[PDB]
């Protein structure tokens, strides 16, 4: 596996503890609807990760990987939408909005190294 690659998996790797983390924090607050999307995130994290597994393992030459980390960024963001739409002003909901934003950010990055991975 090249430098390329392993920085790749360890940012998806690290997605499917944050959402977790998130999940967690989510719960607290009774955010239902949040706590719901959290998990399909959580969800494509798990698949989008072992599909990365595979093909590093094999050769990088990822494609799959990209559309679903697209899928994962469309939950990501649409995550921070519904926070951002339905949050009070507490401590703990400005965390679980930062969050949710950082987690928009890195799988925006992600996508990204993926993409410039599946060009050669
Ligand atoms: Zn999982």
Redesign the pocket.
Same mark, same amino acid.
């Given at each position: 596996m090249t430098k390329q690659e392993k920085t790749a998996l360890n940012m998806a790797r690290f997605i499917?503890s944050q959402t977790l983390t998130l999940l967690e924090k989510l719960n607290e607050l009774d955010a239902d609807e949040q706590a719901d999307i959290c998990e399909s995130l959580? %969800?494509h994290? %798990?698949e989008l990760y072992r599909s990365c597994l595979a093909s590093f393992k094999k050769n990088g030459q990822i494609d799959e990987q990209a559309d679903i980390c697209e899928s994962l960024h469309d939950h990501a963001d649409e995550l921070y939408r519904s926070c951002l739409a339905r949050f009070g002003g507490s401590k703990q909901e400005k965390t679980a909005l930062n969050m949710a934003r950082f987690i928009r950010s890195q799988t925006l990055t992600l996508l990204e190294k993926l993409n410039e991975l599946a060009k050669g």
């Open positions: 499917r959580h %969800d994290a %798990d």
